[PDB]
Design a protein around this ligand. Structure first.
Ligand SMILES: O=C(O)c1cc(I)cc(I)c1O
Ligand SMILES: O=C(O)c1cc(I)cc(I)c1O
Ligand SMILES: O=C(O)c1cc(I)cc(I)c1O
Ligand SMILES: O=C(O)c1cc(I)cc(I)c1O
Ligand SMILES: O=C(O)c1cc(I)cc(I)c1O
Ligand SMILES: O=C(O)c1cc(I)cc(I)c1O
Length: 583
């Protein structure tokens, strides 16, 4: 829904508080390096102009696009050419391409401090100015995660203030805040990863890909809903996601608020779980609906074969209404199977598609696809088998050893990838074992597939920035729903030529001794990646042996009276024993 004067329309619809937040988020994601108070000045300016348009729409500029108003306001700043050399040229053009320049200049790995929460500090800041405190959270998160879902960011910022309203009056503040903050952080990072993937899917694969994921996903949430209604909500949600992924943040939030009201209006025909969401204020209500659990499979549904294998008009429908037919298949399969990962359901519908494209060209099509459902079942078996093998490994070795196995796997599959990225990604992938291996059957397939999709998407995002591996290129571009199976099926990349051991290639030193154990591990895991890059054909055993000798070497030297001496002296011995082990 567009008005002639969009600034007024969205300020009217959103209220000042949320309008300002979204403006601040917008400024923070387009210009991730600029100071807080710079953006804050621009937000206040925009709010005033918003007000004048609400009072009088005929007044000059009020009919401007929001892109125009936002971008002009960003291009107030005199020199940030120094900060954005590649993007200082953005202010040199206009809509719609000035916006597209901003968009392409978002940094997925900004050079920004992992900020340590400091309780006394943050509590003081809360007291001085809690509005500034809320805004600061928006700016710090939005600048680090420039595709963060803007209306959920407001939700999290209200929750963050909530933690401080509670905790900063307690006798012990650290003990109060900290566990709430680490808990919230994990949810925030999860949200950031989900939205990064939604935007990546829109960007690389078209909104149709997101549309498909959401038909499957919503059919599991709202299985008693009819297909008309699931389609109407997916259309609306897809528009919201596309808005937020394109920086149309005020539209994004206004449209998500309307959808929330639509869903709560129809709660009786969607899910009984919505009762818990539907009396909440707007951001909370949207959050709660977005997080809703899967509903019970409705009773007495027909066999799938009726509409998709028996009916004489199968090939007719595929032909004359392809996307509605395949959407229908996704809804009907999804509503019958909440224990299916959404990615598995999308793979079933892809193979069903391929089966008709093949069969509907035959003299007797039904003879050809009669058994399609019988055949689909391997798409369920394959992941269940992979889950069972990998949780066994996790169970026998724990998270660290599991991350080590994964480092070994991914360095073999993509040895061209930067050592920090192989380590970051491998570590992330290993956490699926803690997250998911102890879940029951109802939930273990969705937990693993969802979580692995998020992490492989991070890899794809990093790989797109500087392409190095032909195989990773393949798995990241071939097909979104086959991404995970693609990465799982990559083998050791023999195209890669190791660069030899020069002698003393990677050297541990005394500064390692004083690091927190997490950091010590990462140093060892980096050592491991580097070993594999020199000896890309090393066996599992040889890698186990060298890693044990690494662990022994650091433990021993960090215990020495003279630590650096130990390193310098015992270094060569380790090099020699290693060389003789890798022969
Ligand atoms: O930081 C402030 O002082 C501030 C003030 C206002 I008024 C609105 C937002 I968002 C802010 O961040
Ligand atoms: O994103 C963070 O790193 C983060 C940092 C702090 I301090 C508090 C919360 I909640 C966070 O999510
Ligand atoms: O992802 C959302 O933001 C979302 C928002 C609403 I409102 C409803 C559903 I289902 C969602 O998935
Ligand atoms: O490594 C995999 O290929 C893998 C795939 C699936 I699906 C589940 C788990 I746990 C895994 O470890
Ligand atoms: O502990 C493991 O399960 C493990 C497995 C492999 I494969 C390689 C290394 I180094 C390991 O530490
Ligand atoms: O929640 C989503 O809408 C979502 C969308 C895609 I595309 C992939 C994953 I994992 C998701 O969780």
């Amino acid at each position: 829904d567009t008005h002639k004067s969009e600034i007024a329309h969205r300020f009217n619809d959103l209220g000042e508080e949320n309008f300002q937040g979204l403006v601040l988020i917008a400024f923070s994601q387009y210009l991730q390096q600029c100071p807080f108070d710079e953006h804050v000045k621009l937000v206040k300016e925009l709010t005033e102009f918003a007000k004048t348009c609400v009072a009088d729409e005929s007044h000059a500029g009020c009919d401007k696009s929001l892109h125009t108003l936002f971008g002009d306001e960003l291009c107030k700043v005199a020199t940030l050419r120094e900060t954005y050399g590649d993007m200082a040229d953005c202010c040199e053009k206009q809509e719609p391409e000035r916006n597209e320049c901003f968009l392409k200049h978002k940094d997925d790995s900004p050079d920004l401090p992992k900020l340590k929460p400091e309780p006394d500090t943050l509590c003081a800041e809360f007291k001085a100015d809690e509005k500034k405190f809320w805004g600061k959270y928006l700016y710090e998160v939005a600048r680090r995660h420039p595709y963060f879902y803007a209306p959920e960011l407001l939700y999290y910022a209200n929750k963050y203030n909530g933690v401080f309203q509670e905790c900063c009056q307690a006798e012990d503040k650290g003990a109060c805040l900290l566990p709430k903050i680490e808990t919230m952080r994990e949810k925030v990072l999860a949200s950031s990863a989900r939205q990064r993937l939604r935007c990546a899917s829109i960007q690389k694969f078209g909104e149709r890909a997101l549309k498909a994921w959401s038909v499957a996903r919503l059919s599991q949430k709202f299985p008693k809903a009819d297909f008309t209604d699931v389609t109407k909500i997916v259309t609306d949600l897809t528009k919201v996601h596309k808005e937020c992924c394109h920086g149309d943040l005020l539209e994004c939030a206004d449209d998500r608020a309307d959808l929330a009201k639509y869903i709560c209006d129809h709660q009786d025909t969607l899910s009984s779980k919505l009762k818990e969401c539907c009396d909440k204020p707007v951001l909370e209500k949207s959050h709660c609906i977005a997080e809703i659990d899967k509903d019970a499979v409705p009773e007495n549904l027909p066999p799938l074969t009726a509409d998709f294998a028996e009916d004489k008009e199968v090939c007719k429908n595929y032909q004359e209404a392809k996307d509605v037919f395949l959407g229908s298949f996704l809804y009907e399969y999804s509503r019958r199977h909440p224990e299916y990962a959404v990615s598995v359901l999308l793979r079933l519908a892809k193979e069903y598609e391929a089966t008709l494209e093949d069969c509907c060209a035959k003299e007797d099509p039904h003879a050809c696809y009669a058994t399609v459902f019988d055949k689909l079942k391997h798409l369920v078996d394959e992941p269940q088998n992979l889950i069972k093998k990998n949780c066994e490994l996790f169970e026998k070795h724990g998270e660290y050893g599991f991350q080590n196995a994964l480092i070994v796997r991914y360095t073999r599959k993509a040895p061209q990838v930067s050592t920090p990225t192989l380590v970051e990604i491998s570590r992330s992938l290993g956490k699926v074992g803690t997250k998911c291996c102890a879940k029951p059957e109802s939930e273990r397939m969705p937990c693993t597939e969802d979580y692995l999709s998020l992490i492989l998407n991070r890899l794809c995002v990093l790989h797109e920035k500087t392409p190095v591996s032909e195989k990773v290129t393949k798995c990241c571009t071939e097909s979104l729903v086959n991404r995970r199976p693609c990465f799982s099926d990559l083998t050791l990349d023999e195209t890669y030529v190791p660069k030899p051991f020069d002698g003393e290639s990677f050297t541990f030193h005394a500064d390692i001794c004083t690091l927190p154990d997490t950091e010590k591990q990462i140093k060892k895991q980096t050592a491991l990646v580097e070993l594999l890059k020199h000896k890309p054909k090393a066996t599992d055993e040889q890698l186990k042996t060298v890693m044990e000798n690494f662990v022994a070497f650091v433990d021993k030297c960090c215990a020495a009276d003279d630590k650096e001496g130990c390193f310098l002296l015992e270094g060569p011995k380790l090099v020699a024993s290693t060389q003789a082990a890798l022969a």
